[PDB]
CSV table of C-alpha atoms and ligand atoms in Angstrom, one decimal:
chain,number,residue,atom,x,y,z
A,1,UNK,CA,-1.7,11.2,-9.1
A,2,UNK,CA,-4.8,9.2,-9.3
A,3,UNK,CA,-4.4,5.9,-10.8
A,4,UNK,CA,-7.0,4.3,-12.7
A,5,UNK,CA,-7.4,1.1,-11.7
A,6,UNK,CA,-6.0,-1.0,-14.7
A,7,UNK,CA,-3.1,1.5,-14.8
A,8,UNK,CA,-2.3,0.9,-11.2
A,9,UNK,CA,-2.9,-3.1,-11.4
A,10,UNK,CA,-0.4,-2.3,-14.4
A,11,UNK,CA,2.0,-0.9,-12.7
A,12,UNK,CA,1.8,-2.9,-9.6
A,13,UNK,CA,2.5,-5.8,-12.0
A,14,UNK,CA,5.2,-4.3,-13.2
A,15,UNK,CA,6.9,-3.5,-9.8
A,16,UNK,CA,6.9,-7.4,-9.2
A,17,UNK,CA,3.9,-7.3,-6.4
A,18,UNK,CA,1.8,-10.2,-8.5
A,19,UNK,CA,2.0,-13.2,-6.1
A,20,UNK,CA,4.8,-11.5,-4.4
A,21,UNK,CA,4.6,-13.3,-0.6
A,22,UNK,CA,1.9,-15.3,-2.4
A,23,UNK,CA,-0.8,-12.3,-2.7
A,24,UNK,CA,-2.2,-12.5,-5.7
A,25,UNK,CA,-2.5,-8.7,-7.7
A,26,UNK,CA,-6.3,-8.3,-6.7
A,27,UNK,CA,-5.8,-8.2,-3.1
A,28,UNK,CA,-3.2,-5.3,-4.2
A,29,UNK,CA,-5.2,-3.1,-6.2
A,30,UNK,CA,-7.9,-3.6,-3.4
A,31,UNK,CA,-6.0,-2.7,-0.6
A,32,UNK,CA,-4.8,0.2,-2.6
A,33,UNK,CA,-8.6,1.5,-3.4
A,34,UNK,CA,-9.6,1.1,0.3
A,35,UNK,CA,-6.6,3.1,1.4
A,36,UNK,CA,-6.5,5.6,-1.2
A,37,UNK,CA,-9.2,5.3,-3.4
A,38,UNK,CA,-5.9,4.8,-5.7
A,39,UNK,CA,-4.8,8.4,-4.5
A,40,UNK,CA,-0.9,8.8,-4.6
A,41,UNK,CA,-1.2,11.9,-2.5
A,42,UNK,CA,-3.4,10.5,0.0
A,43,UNK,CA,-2.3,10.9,3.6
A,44,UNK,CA,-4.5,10.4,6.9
A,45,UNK,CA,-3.5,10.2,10.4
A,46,UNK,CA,-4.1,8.0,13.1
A,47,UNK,CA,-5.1,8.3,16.7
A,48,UNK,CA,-1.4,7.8,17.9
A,49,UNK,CA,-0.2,10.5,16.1
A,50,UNK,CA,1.1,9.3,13.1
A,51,UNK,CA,0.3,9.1,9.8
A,52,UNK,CA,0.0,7.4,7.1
A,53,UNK,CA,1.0,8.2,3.3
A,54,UNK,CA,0.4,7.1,-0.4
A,55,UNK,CA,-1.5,4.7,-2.5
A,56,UNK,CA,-1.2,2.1,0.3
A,57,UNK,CA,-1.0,4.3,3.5
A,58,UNK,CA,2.4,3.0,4.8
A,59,UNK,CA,2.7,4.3,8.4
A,60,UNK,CA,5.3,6.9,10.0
A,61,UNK,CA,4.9,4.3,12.9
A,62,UNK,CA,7.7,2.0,11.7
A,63,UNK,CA,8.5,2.4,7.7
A,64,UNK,CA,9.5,6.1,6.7
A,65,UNK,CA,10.4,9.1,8.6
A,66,UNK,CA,8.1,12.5,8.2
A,67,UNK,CA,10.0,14.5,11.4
A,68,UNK,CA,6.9,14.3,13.4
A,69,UNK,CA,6.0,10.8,14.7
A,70,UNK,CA,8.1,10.2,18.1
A,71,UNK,CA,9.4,7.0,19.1
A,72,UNK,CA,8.9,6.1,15.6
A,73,UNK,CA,11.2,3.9,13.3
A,74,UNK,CA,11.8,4.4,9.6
A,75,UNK,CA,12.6,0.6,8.5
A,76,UNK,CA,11.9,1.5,5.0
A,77,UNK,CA,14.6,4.0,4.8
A,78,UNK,CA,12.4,7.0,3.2
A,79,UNK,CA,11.1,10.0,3.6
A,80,UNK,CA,7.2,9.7,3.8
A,81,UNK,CA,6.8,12.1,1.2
A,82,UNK,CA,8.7,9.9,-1.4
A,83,UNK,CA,5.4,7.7,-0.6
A,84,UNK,CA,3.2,10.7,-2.5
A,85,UNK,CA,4.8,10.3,-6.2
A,86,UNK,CA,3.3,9.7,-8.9
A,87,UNK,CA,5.9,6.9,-9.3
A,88,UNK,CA,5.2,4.5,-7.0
A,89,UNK,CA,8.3,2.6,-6.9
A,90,UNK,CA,9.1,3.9,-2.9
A,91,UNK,CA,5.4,2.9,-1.6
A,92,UNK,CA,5.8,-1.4,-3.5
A,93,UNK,CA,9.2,-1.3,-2.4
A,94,UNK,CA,8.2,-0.1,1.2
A,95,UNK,CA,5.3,-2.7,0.9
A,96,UNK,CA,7.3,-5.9,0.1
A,97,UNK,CA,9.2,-5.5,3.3
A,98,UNK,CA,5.7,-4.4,5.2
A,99,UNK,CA,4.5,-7.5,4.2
A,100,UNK,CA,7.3,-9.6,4.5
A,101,UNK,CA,7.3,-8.9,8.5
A,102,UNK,CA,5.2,-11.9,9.7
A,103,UNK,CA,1.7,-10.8,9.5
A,104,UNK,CA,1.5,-10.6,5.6
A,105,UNK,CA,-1.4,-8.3,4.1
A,106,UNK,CA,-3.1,-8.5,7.6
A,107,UNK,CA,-0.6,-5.4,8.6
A,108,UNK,CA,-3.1,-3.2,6.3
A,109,UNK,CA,-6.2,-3.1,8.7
A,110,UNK,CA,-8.6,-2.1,5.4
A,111,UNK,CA,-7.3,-5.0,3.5
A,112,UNK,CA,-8.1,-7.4,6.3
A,113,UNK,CA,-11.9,-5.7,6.9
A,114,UNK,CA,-12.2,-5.4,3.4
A,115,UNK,CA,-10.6,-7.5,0.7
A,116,UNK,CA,-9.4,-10.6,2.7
A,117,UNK,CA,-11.3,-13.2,1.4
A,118,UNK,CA,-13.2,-11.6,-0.7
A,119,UNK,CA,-13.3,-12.1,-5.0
A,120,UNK,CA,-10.2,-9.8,-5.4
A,121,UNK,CA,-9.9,-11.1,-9.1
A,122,UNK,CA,-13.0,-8.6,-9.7
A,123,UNK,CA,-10.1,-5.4,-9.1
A,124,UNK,CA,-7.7,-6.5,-11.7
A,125,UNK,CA,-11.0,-7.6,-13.8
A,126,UNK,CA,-10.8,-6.5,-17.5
A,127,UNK,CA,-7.6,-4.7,-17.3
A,128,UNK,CA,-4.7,-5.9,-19.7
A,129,UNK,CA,-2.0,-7.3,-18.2
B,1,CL,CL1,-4.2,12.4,-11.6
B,2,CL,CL1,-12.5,1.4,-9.1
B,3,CL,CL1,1.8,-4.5,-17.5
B,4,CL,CL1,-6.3,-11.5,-8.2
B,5,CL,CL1,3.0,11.9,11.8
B,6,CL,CL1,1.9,4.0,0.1
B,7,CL,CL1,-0.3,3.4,14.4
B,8,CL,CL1,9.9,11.2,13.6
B,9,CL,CL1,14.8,3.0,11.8
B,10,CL,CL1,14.0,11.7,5.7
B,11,CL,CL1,4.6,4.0,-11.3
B,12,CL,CL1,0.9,-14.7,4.3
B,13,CL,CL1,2.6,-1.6,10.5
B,14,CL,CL1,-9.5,-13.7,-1.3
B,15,NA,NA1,-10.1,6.3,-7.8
B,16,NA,NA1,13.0,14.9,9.5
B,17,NA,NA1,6.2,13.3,-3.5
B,18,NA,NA1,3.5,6.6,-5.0
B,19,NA,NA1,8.8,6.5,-6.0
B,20,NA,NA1,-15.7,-2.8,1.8
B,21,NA,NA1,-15.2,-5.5,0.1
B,22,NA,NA1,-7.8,-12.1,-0.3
Protein backbone atom coordinates (compact mmCIF):
# COMPACT_ATOMS: atom_id res chain seq x y z
CA UNK A 1 0.00 0.00 0.00
CA UNK A 2 1.01 3.48 -0.66
CA UNK A 3 -0.06 5.88 1.90
CA UNK A 4 -0.94 9.29 1.24
CA UNK A 5 0.60 11.41 3.41
CA UNK A 6 -2.36 12.72 5.60
CA UNK A 7 -3.56 9.09 5.71
CA UNK A 8 -0.32 7.90 6.97
CA UNK A 9 0.23 10.96 9.49
CA UNK A 10 -3.33 9.64 10.43
CA UNK A 11 -2.61 6.56 11.06
CA UNK A 12 0.72 7.10 12.67
CA UNK A 13 -1.41 9.27 15.12
CA UNK A 14 -3.45 6.80 15.76
CA UNK A 15 -0.79 4.04 16.59
CA UNK A 16 0.37 6.51 19.46
CA UNK A 17 3.81 7.59 17.59
CA UNK A 18 2.79 11.58 18.12
CA UNK A 19 5.50 12.78 20.59
CA UNK A 20 6.09 9.25 21.40
CA UNK A 21 10.03 9.46 22.90
CA UNK A 22 9.37 13.11 22.39
CA UNK A 23 9.37 13.06 18.37
CA UNK A 24 6.87 15.02 17.32
CA UNK A 25 4.50 13.33 14.15
CA UNK A 26 6.48 15.40 11.36
CA UNK A 27 9.73 13.86 11.93
CA UNK A 28 7.52 10.50 11.47
CA UNK A 29 5.86 11.02 8.37
CA UNK A 30 9.31 12.38 7.10
CA UNK A 31 11.32 9.63 7.96
CA UNK A 32 8.69 7.52 6.50
CA UNK A 33 8.76 9.53 2.91
CA UNK A 34 12.63 9.29 2.85
CA UNK A 35 12.55 5.63 3.43
CA UNK A 36 9.68 4.66 1.49
CA UNK A 37 8.39 7.40 -0.25
CA UNK A 38 5.38 6.07 2.13
CA UNK A 39 5.65 2.59 0.37
CA UNK A 40 4.49 -0.29 2.71
CA UNK A 41 6.12 -2.78 0.36
CA UNK A 42 9.27 -1.06 0.07
CA UNK A 43 12.33 -3.21 0.85
CA UNK A 44 16.13 -2.26 -0.02
CA UNK A 45 19.25 -3.96 1.07
CA UNK A 46 22.28 -2.85 2.54
CA UNK A 47 25.97 -3.43 1.95
CA UNK A 48 26.19 -6.01 4.81
CA UNK A 49 23.73 -8.06 3.51
CA UNK A 50 20.69 -7.29 5.09
CA UNK A 51 17.77 -5.64 4.41
CA UNK A 52 15.51 -3.47 5.18
CA UNK A 53 11.57 -3.55 5.01
CA UNK A 54 8.36 -1.32 5.09
CA UNK A 55 7.19 2.24 5.43
CA UNK A 56 10.18 2.92 7.74
CA UNK A 57 12.82 0.39 6.51
CA UNK A 58 13.35 -1.48 9.84
CA UNK A 59 16.52 -3.60 9.41
CA UNK A 60 16.99 -7.61 9.41
CA UNK A 61 20.20 -6.53 11.29
CA UNK A 62 18.61 -6.56 14.73
CA UNK A 63 14.57 -6.09 14.68
CA UNK A 64 12.81 -9.01 12.53
CA UNK A 65 13.95 -12.13 11.11
CA UNK A 66 13.69 -12.76 7.03
CA UNK A 67 15.89 -16.28 7.11
CA UNK A 68 18.68 -14.68 5.30
CA UNK A 69 20.65 -12.04 7.37
CA UNK A 70 23.40 -14.15 9.50
CA UNK A 71 24.49 -13.16 12.80
CA UNK A 72 21.44 -11.19 12.87
CA UNK A 73 18.94 -10.65 15.81
CA UNK A 74 15.17 -10.31 15.55
CA UNK A 75 14.46 -7.95 18.82
CA UNK A 76 11.20 -7.08 17.46
CA UNK A 77 9.90 -10.50 17.39
CA UNK A 78 8.56 -10.56 13.56
CA UNK A 79 8.86 -11.75 10.59
CA UNK A 80 10.13 -8.97 8.18
CA UNK A 81 7.42 -9.51 5.96
CA UNK A 82 4.72 -8.55 8.57
CA UNK A 83 6.75 -5.08 8.06
CA UNK A 84 5.07 -5.03 4.23
CA UNK A 85 1.17 -4.71 5.32
CA UNK A 86 -0.91 -2.46 4.52
CA UNK A 87 -1.56 -2.28 8.26
CA UNK A 88 1.21 -0.87 9.77
CA UNK A 89 0.65 -1.83 13.23
CA UNK A 90 4.07 -4.42 13.15
CA UNK A 91 6.47 -1.52 11.49
CA UNK A 92 5.17 1.59 14.71
CA UNK A 93 5.24 -1.21 17.07
CA UNK A 94 8.78 -2.33 15.85
CA UNK A 95 9.70 1.50 15.75
CA UNK A 96 8.86 2.45 19.38
CA UNK A 97 11.30 -0.11 20.61
CA UNK A 98 13.91 1.01 17.59
CA UNK A 99 13.75 4.24 18.99
CA UNK A 100 13.60 3.55 22.41
CA UNK A 101 17.33 1.94 22.20
CA UNK A 102 19.45 5.03 23.09
CA UNK A 103 20.04 6.73 19.93
CA UNK A 104 16.36 7.96 19.29
CA UNK A 105 15.43 8.81 15.52
CA UNK A 106 19.18 9.05 14.82
CA UNK A 107 19.08 5.02 14.28
CA UNK A 108 17.17 5.94 10.81
CA UNK A 109 20.35 7.32 8.84
CA UNK A 110 17.69 9.26 6.27
CA UNK A 111 15.93 10.90 9.12
CA UNK A 112 19.12 12.11 10.54
CA UNK A 113 20.47 13.48 6.77
CA UNK A 114 17.18 14.57 6.06
CA UNK A 115 14.56 15.59 8.48
CA UNK A 116 16.58 16.28 11.71
CA UNK A 117 16.15 19.66 12.27
CA UNK A 118 14.47 20.53 9.64
CA UNK A 119 10.45 22.17 9.57
CA UNK A 120 8.98 18.67 9.97
CA UNK A 121 5.49 20.45 10.88
CA UNK A 122 5.43 21.09 6.89
CA UNK A 123 4.71 16.83 6.50
CA UNK A 124 1.75 16.68 8.73
CA UNK A 125 0.82 20.30 7.12
CA UNK A 126 -2.86 20.49 6.23
CA UNK A 127 -3.88 17.05 7.03
CA UNK A 128 -6.71 16.55 9.65
CA UNK A 129 -5.78 15.19 12.67
CL1 LIG B 1 -1.82 1.60 -2.72
CL1 LIG C 1 4.44 13.89 -0.13
CL1 LIG D 1 -6.63 10.57 13.26
CL1 LIG E 1 5.50 17.99 13.64
CL1 LIG F 1 18.50 -9.92 4.33
CL1 LIG G 1 8.91 -0.42 8.43
CL1 LIG H 1 23.20 -2.78 8.52
CL1 LIG I 1 18.50 -14.70 9.67
CL1 LIG J 1 16.63 -12.04 18.84
CL1 LIG K 1 9.85 -15.45 11.43
CL1 LIG L 1 -2.73 1.18 9.38
CL1 LIG M 1 15.90 11.47 21.81
CL1 LIG N 1 19.42 -0.25 13.81
CL1 LIG O 1 13.25 19.56 13.63
NA1 LIG P 1 4.26 8.56 -1.96
NA1 LIG Q 1 13.20 -18.05 8.75
NA1 LIG R 1 2.93 -8.50 4.28
NA1 LIG S 1 3.20 -1.67 7.22
NA1 LIG T 1 0.85 -4.96 10.79
NA1 LIG U 1 16.25 15.67 1.66
NA1 LIG V 1 14.93 17.63 3.89
NA1 LIG W 1 13.47 17.03 13.70
Amino acid sequence: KVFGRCELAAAMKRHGLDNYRGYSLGNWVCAAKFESNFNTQATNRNTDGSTDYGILQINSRWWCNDGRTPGSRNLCNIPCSALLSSDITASVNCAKKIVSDGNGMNAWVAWRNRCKGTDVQAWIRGCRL
